[PDB]
Design a protein around this nucleic acid. Structure first.
Ligand code: FES
Lengths: 85, 115, 78, 154
RNA sequence: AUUAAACCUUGUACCUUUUGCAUAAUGAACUAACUAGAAAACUUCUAACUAAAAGAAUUACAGCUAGAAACCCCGAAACCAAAC
RNA sequence: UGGUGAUAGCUGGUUACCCAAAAAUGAAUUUAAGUUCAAUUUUAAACUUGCUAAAAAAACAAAAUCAAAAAGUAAGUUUAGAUUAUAGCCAAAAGAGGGGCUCUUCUGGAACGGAAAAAACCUUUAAUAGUGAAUAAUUAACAACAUUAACCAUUGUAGGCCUAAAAGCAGCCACCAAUAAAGAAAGCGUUCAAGCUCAACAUAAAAUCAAAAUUCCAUAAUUUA
RNA sequence: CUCUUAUCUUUAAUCAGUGAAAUUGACCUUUCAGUGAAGAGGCUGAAAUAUAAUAAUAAGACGAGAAGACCCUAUGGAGCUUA
């Protein structure tokens, strides 16, 4: 319940989704030594990193997909204007 | 399907707040229904798109081939335009990326409440 | 079987969501001409890797250590 | 199927609601009046203009045949029984020489229209029917009582 | 499950067979023992040796030699011979 | 008694565990409880495109068949060996006979949730522990008003028609007048007519459909956002 | 028979001795309505309900049943006979 309101505020609809409560470590050593990263957090972290690399690669490919069109138009444009002798 | 469905009107632009120029590049799609009891062509399209698990975010290009494939499964997916307020992430910030429900992919996650 | 009030509302909400999908499909960023051949190079490379993996079947080797190591089964206190 | 029935219910036509019901509406304008009835105006206008003094007496449950006989009887008195439907009589004052004689012509009443001051003949008409009540006589188109009619008639 | 054996909550016996369904239909008082898949002509695999292989009879233009790998039970109406 | 463990395409039964893969099309058959052929599947080998999609386009008549480039994606073709399978069920579409049914063709299904119990309808990607969380389908649902209400009915003429007679009113006519208002008559009455009203005139006032035989069968309930 | 009654004997019931058979998945073995294949002690929804015993009757469930009864077919078989 309450997912719609949470979305309105920009937060995750499910409190168990993306948030500091879930993401942050749940404990630490009494001596103050940092706790090891959570296996679930690491697994979730890996997927986000993989998606980020894909997103960058796609945009790079997309940039060429449109930019190349301009380079093929320049080839077409220059081809039209031709002369010799 | 007639193209008129995908021909926007001035009111539609205001309702969705999308400018007819500078069209968005990347689509966000999530499966919201089961393919059981559906025809084989519907089943095949979902498998091809990779939306085997429901409520799973996927990165796709806003290109005619992808657009055509999405149209076939339009009723089974939710389409949200990807926004980059801070731009594309760098190699250093590749590990700090996070996609919000609003549709904006931040390149830096500071673990600070938006409040 | 008269339709419950909740049922009517739920379908209407889903219909609106599908309408939003239509609008975001109404602005194709790339035209057909630009799309052609933009990713052909990447697709070819992926197929080559697929072929190599598929044709990697072959019988396995046999090693002397396997037969010789079996003699360790008789190890005991001195 | 049930699922198809769900689609029909949602597609049901929705009627808009008027702000105010026709009965409870604010006062709206109305079309201008039209005189249909116009013929009867000419007939009454002629008889009243011709006859200065009119003796107004309530009509008892008389018969149509008697009125013709009484009409001939007045011809001996030099008076005419010219009558018409009274629902057009009230608008007579609206379009006629006078506008102020409406109270005299109230209800259904016999009208004795005479152009000459022959008092004796008018009095004789009164003597014809005692039970029939004479409201009065507008001598010279001036409102007067039955008793006043006799007094001025003298 | 529970502090608590019964109460409250959940749950349409079994085998076979019918349609991939039984509120059908068969079979079962229960206990113990007994009670139903068996063959190598050729192939793959494991090795020997090799233009040769096999301790005689066989095959051979890489073959040949050895090993391993396989196919149930109970139950008719009957038919015939010889005695009684 | 022996042949004899006769035979039986028939009936019944046929004893441990785990992982993987796995479907009642076409042709013939004393054939439809089986078997062969095609097709599938399958093992090995050879080496490279395949599946979805796919513009213009012809073909047809005036969204599939065909398949440039793509794109999404990872299998595919050929050679060699080899079997198994070869009876559905129900829902929902399109046809064809009947005119509910009888068929042919296409699509989907096999909850531990829901529609009352519910193989066939809806929501549902596998299965793991937890005294977590967000959601999906989801037995119920809130009579019809937009011309018609008071009063009166005089006269020609019982107008001509076989009608004895039919006078508004048996038939039959055409279809005028006076009057303020009279239908040469609208329903009644009719030995025939006298005679009952409706229309006449005067006086009234209005204004597009809904929510059979054992014993009833949850209980109830109209408003705190 | 109208129109049944009375008595005796057998059975019956009590005591003591001896002591089977068909049958049997397990049963902590209810009513109504629904559902279903004509169909419910065991499902759905209502209802009823100290435990255990004891004694009586055979109408219905178109009761359960068999290779019972009757008639006819087969371009079915098989057996038999021929002129
Ligand atoms: S509120 Fe009824 S007429 Fe105005």
């Amino acid at each position: 319940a309450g997912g719609q309101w949470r979305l309105q505020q920009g937060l995750a609809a499910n409190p168990s989704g993306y948030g500091p409560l879930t993401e942050l470590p749940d404990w630490s050593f009494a001596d103050g030594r940092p706790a090891p990263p959570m296996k679930g957090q690491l697994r979730r972290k890996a997927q986000r990193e993989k998606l980020a690399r894909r997103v960058v690669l796609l945009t790079q490919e997309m940039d060429a997909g449109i930019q190349a069109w301009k380079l093929r138009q320049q080839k077409l444009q220059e081809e039209r204007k031709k002369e010799h002798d | 399907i007639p193209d008129k469905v995908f021909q926007p009107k001035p009111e539609d632009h205001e309702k969705y707040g999308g400018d007819p120029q500078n069209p968005h590049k990347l689509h966000i799609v999530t499966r919201i229904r089961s393919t059981k009891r559906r025809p084989y062509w519907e089943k095949d399209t979902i498998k091809m798109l990779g939306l085997q698990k429901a409520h799973s975010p996927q990165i796709h290009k806003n290109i005619p081939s992808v657009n055509a494939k999405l149209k076939v499964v339009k009723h089974l997916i939710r389409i949200q335009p990807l926004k980059l307020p801070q731009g594309l992430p760098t190699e250093e910030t590749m590990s700090s990326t996070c996609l919000k429900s609003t549709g904006e992919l931040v390149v830096q996650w500071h673990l600070k409440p938006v409040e | 079987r008269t339709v419950s009030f909740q049922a009517k509302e739920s379908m209407i909400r889903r219909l609106e969501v599908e309408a939003e999908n239509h609008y975001w499909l109404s602005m194709p960023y790339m035209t057909a001409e630009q799309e052609c051949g933009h990713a052909a190079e990447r697709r070819a490379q992926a197929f080559e890797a697929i072929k190599a993996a598929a044709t990697s079947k072959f019988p396995k080797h046999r090693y002397i250590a396997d037969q010789l190591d079996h003699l360790n089964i008789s190890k005991k206190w001195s | 199927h049930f699922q198809r029935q769900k689609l029909m219910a949602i597609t049901e036509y929705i009627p808009p609601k008027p702000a105010i019901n026709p009965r409870c509406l604010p006062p709206p304008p109305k079309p201008p009046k039209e005189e249909s009835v116009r013929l009867l105006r000419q007939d009454i206008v002629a008889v009243f203009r011709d006859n200065r003094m009119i003796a107004v007496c309530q009509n008892v449950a008389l018969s149509a045949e008697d009125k013709l006989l009484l009409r001939h009887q007045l011809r001996k008195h030099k008076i005419f029984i010219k009558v018409f439907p009274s629902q057009v009589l009230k608008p007579f004052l609206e379009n006629s020489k006078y506008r102020n004689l409406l109270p005299l012509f109230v209800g259904h009443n016999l009208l004795l229209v005479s152009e000459e001051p022959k008092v004796k003949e008018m009095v004789r008409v009164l003597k014809s029917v005692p039970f029939l009540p004479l409201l009065g006589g507008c001598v010279d188109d001036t409102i007067l009582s039955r008793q006043g009619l006799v007094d001025y008639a003298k």
